[PDB]
Amino acid sequence: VSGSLRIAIPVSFSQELIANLCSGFMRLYPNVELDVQFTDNDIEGYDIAIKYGPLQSSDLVARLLFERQPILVASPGYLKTRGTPATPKELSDHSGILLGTSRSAPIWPLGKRKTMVSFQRKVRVNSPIMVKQLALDDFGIAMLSNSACKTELANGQLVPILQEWPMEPFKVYGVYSSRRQLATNISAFLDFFVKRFSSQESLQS
Amino acid sequence: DVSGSLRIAIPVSFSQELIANLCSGFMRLYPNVELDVQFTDNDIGLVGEGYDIAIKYGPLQSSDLVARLLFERQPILVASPGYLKTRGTPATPKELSDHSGILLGTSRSAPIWPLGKGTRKTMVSFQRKVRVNSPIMVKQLALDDFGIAMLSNSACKTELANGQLVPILQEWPMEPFKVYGVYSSRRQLATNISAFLDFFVKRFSSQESLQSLM
């Protein structure tokens, strides 16, 4: 396992988390050089693109890496001031904190009871760090990973709402070219990535 | 009146935690502003339906933009004691080409640092062990002994004071870097824009816990 590995990762991934992962990877494989770009471009000479599902027709070779379960939450202060929405249709009268890029719409798919609803777009940002802080700071309703916020849920700083209409889990994949189907550095990296996001101190985002 | 929407573009290398704290404070002061904040390294427009503000590192190179200096930092070259104990300490810039560097950069950034005794800087190359567009990852990898890194002496104050990072080549410093908020001249109505940029400086400069973030 050697050579160079150029990897694209959405801006919504935690840079702290990916840093810890790449450190452990390089410790195991000392002869690999890394070029990691946090970017929201739809992938430019990349060996691996990390992507959220669903995969597109251009994604001809891919590996499922992990899944996460989002949940809708707000702070108790927000719910005291604005009320607790009783059904998804009431989200239209509520402030939401949208995780998205410059063409992402303030629409959330809820239920399985399956429906798509809008909300007042108080903030749009492509940073989960900022989404979480703004939710804690009483600004409105946010979709957060149930694993990313277990402490805040346990201590009541975030409150789950509309639990009768759960969201579909999201899946994360690694996409790579069939030209590199035999590449040992790609396989080594994705194996290490899967082990971290499945059994580790890394299940925090 | 400060109200309506503000759209802000920010480099991917910029602290998301710092921006989150400042945006929370801004919206608590101005409850009628809706924010659209995008961390991006793409070229973005500053007119019409494009962005209202871009946060940009120096140098400024464009007329038709107005700029407000948000803060300035002094980068220094550092490595961990563990790195230096095994690879040796470079004595001159010429020796850096034999050393591992952790490069902060995007897809066209070269593995060079401009170093110089005085104002005149010269390109100094290193082995590109890592390139990444994240100061957080750069710092962690330097702390974990993977190579030499350019780091802000503010972001790394604690690690320098206690020895987990060690400055090198101190006789060939780098230029400071400067962080601006920029907006279009061809765009007037800068009530919300000026309110944001001046709140940024007022809150950043009075909160020590924020100054450590970059």
Author numbering:
A (entry chain B): 90 to 132, 137 to 205, 208 to 300
B (entry chain A): 89 to 302
Task: Give the published text.
Here, we describe the discovery of a LysR type transcriptional regulator (LTTR), AccR (for ACCase regulator) in S. oneidensis, which directly and specifically activates transcription of the accS gene as a canonical LTTR. Like other LTTRs, AccR is predicted to form a N-terminal winged helix-turn-helix (wHTH) DNA-binding domain (DBD) and a C-terminal EBD (also called regulatory domain, RD) that are connected by a linker made of an extended helix and a flexible hinge. We showed that AccR interacts with the accS promoter in vivo in response to changes in acetyl-CoA levels and in vitro. Multiple lines of evidence indicate that acetyl-CoA is one of the effectors.
Despite numerous trials, we were not able to obtain any crystal hits for the full-length AccR. EBD crystals were rod-shaped, belonging to the space group C2. An EBD dimer was found in each asymmetric unit, with the two subunits arranged in an antiparallel manner. The final structural model of AccR EBD contains residues 89–302 for subunit A and residues 90–300 for the subunit B, except for residues 132–136 and 206–207 in two surface loops of the subunit B that are structurally disordered. Superimposition of the two EBD subunits in a dimer gave an overall r.m.s.d. of 0.25 Å for 204 common Cα atoms, suggesting nearly identical conformation. In the AccR EBD dimer, ∼3200 Å2 of surface area is buried at the dimer interface, which is mostly mediated by α5, β4 with α7 and β10 from the adjacent subunit, suggesting stable molecular interactions. Structural comparison indicates that AccR EBD has a large, ‘primary’ funnel-shaped ligand binding pocket within a monomer. This funnel-shaped pocket, which runs through the entire molecule, is 25 Å by 20 Å wide near its opening, with most of the surface being neutral to positively charged. In addition, another ‘secondary’ pocket is found at the regulatory domain dimerization interface and contains S103 and E105 from both chains of the dimer. However, this secondary pocket found in AccR may not interact with acetyl-CoA because it is a negatively charged cavity as seen by the surface charge representation, and acetyl-CoA is also negatively charged.
